[PDB]
Amino acid sequence: AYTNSFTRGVYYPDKVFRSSVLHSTQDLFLPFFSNVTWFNPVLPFNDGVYFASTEKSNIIRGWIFGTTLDSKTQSLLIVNNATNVVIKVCEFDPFFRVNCTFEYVSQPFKNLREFVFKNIDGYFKIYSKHTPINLVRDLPQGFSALEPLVDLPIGINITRFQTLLAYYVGYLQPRTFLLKYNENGTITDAVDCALDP
Amino acid sequence: NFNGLTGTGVLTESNKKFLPFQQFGRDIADTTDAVRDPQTLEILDITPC
Numbered sequence: 001a002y003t004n005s006f007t008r009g010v011y012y013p014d015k016v017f018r019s020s021v022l023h024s025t026q027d028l029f030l031p032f033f034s035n036v037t038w039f040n041p042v043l044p045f046n047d048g049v050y051f052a053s054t055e056k057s058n059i060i061r062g063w064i065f066g067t068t069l070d071s072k073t074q075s076l077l078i079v080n081n082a083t084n085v086v087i088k089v090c091e092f093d094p095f096f097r098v099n100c101t102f103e104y105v106s107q108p109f110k111n112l113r114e115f116v117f118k119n120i121d122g123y124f125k126i127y128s129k130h131t132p133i134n135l136v137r138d139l140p141q142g143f144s145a146l147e148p149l150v151d152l153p154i155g156i157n158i159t160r161f162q163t164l165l166a167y168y169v170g171y172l173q174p175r176t177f178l179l180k181y182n183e184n185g186t187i188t189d190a191v192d193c194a195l196d197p
Numbered sequence: 198n199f200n201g202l203t204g205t206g207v208l209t210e211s212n213k214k215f216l217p218f219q220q221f222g223r224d225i226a227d228t229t230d231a232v233r234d235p236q237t238l239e240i241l242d243i244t245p246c
């Protein structure tokens with residue numbers, strides 16, 4: 001199964017304040033109108049993952065990111081529980097039935113939840129946005145940028161990932177975007193410079 | 198010197214709506230025109246003397 005990503009999956013490329021300006025940047029972004037698979041198998045991570053879900057029952061518990069996903073290698077486990085999120089890295093049909101070096105605990109995260117997962121420069125970078133939508137079978141149109149949620153300096157190899165329990169999965173590509181910042185420094189629009197002439 | 202960032206100028210209160218993660222803004226010459234004070238988390242505008 002497959003749907004249309006439209007103009008979703010754009011996130012703030014850095015942490016610098018800008019306003020009333022068109023800024024040109026090159027980074028790993030979800031290409032506009034890219035084919036986004038609509039979904040529980042283990043999936044490739046490739047160069048980064050666009051993830052979104054529309055569960056009204058708080059089904060998505062979290063995610064597993066790693067390679068072999070077994071006792072041979074360090075892997076990242078992100079699990080959401082009541083009023084908390086727990087993130088750990090250890091030598092770890094999961095769903096509670098799912099050498100530790102990373103311990104992190106912070107705040108938890110019709111209701112469309114959008115996430116971007118990157119694994120670059122030793123950082124597992126998570127971007128996130130939460131908005132209401134009026135559709136169930138597809139992703140909404142219009143534009144909304146994802147602010148960074150957490151920067152995790154866990155220096156591990158990720159090639160595959162799995163979702164802990166509908167959801168959508170896309171992949172990021174090296175693309176150039178022209179981003180439009182409004183008077184409050186919010187990215188309100190964008191152009192995918194390689195979409196068409 | 199703000200958290201390692203140096204320069205010369207007049208500091209005033211900023212009215213820029215920085216997001217919770219942003220520490221400084223940049224101009225078209227890639228100069229810094231605003232910073233987040235590392236102790237008070239106050240946003241300050243930088244206007245050259």
Ligand SMILES: *[C@@H]1O[C@H](CO)[C@@H](O)[C@H](O)[C@H]1NC(C)=O
Pocket residue numbers: 001002003004033034035
């Ligand atoms: C997405 O993939 C599906 C299934 O292969 C195909 O039917 C559809 O045309 C594709 N859409 C786009 C936008 O590439």
Ligand SMILES: *[C@@H]1O[C@H](CO)[C@@H](O)[C@H](O)[C@H]1NC(C)=O
Pocket residue numbers: 071072091092099
């Ligand atoms: C943890 O590291 C030690 C190496 O001293 C290894 O023997 C042990 O099996 C590792 N844990 C797992 C689950 O492999």
Ligand SMILES: *[C@@H]1O[C@H](CO)[C@@H](O)[C@H](O)[C@H]1NC(C)=O
Pocket residue numbers: 081082083084086105
């Ligand atoms: C969520 O899980 C963590 C495990 O680190 C635990 O410490 C915390 O108390 C749990 N929260 C609740 C409400 O049970």
Ligand SMILES: *[C@@H]1O[C@H](CO)[C@@H](O)[C@H](O)[C@H]1NC(C)=O
Pocket residue numbers: 067157158159
């Ligand atoms: C991650 O593991 C895979 C195993 O198939 C390997 O091919 C790849 O080069 C490794 N990447 C890094 C950065 O270690």
Ligand SMILES: *[C@@H]1O[C@H](CO)[C@@H](O)[C@H](O)[C@H]1NC(C)=O
Pocket residue numbers: 182183184214
């Ligand atoms: C965001 O920009 C709009 C102008 O479109 C303005 O009316 C609104 O007050 C701004 N938000 C804040 C917090 O200043």
Ligand SMILES: *[C@@H]1O[C@H](CO)[C@@H](O)[C@H](O)[C@H]1NC(C)=O
Pocket residue numbers: 235236237238
């Ligand atoms: C750090 O500095 C900030 C800003 O002046 C102040 O609000 C805060 O109380 C200070 N904290 C400590 C631990 O000294």
